[PDB]
Design a protein around this nucleic acid. Structure first.
Length: 86
RNA sequence: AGAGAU
């Protein structure tokens, strides 16, 4: 309840800025901003960062795609460092 | 893996 930013790693570009956002905003409620840090050199190391409205949403995203084997790659969808511990 | 380039 204090974070909101997810980290997305290893995954075919099926997930792109708009699709990750569509998935995030509908499956997860509006992704405020999706950071595509890689993909500038080339489609290599496609990892991203996505921003969500509060966490129910972000926490939702990591739950939905983490551990997904897509095209032979296991997705590493994770949310920010948990600040809802205590 | 867990940091913002586009």
């Amino acid at each position: 309840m204090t974070e909101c930013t997810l980290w997305m790693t290893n995954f075919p570009p099926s997930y792109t800025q708009r699709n990750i956002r569509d998935l995030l905003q509908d499956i997860n409620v509006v992704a405020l901003s999706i950071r595509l840090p890689s993909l500038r050199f080339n489609t290599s190391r496609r990892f991203a960062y996505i921003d969500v409205t509060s966490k129910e949403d972000a926490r939702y995203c990591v739950e939905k795609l983490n551990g997904l084997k897509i095209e032979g790659y296991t997705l590493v969808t994770k949310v920010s460092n948990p600040l809802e511990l205590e």
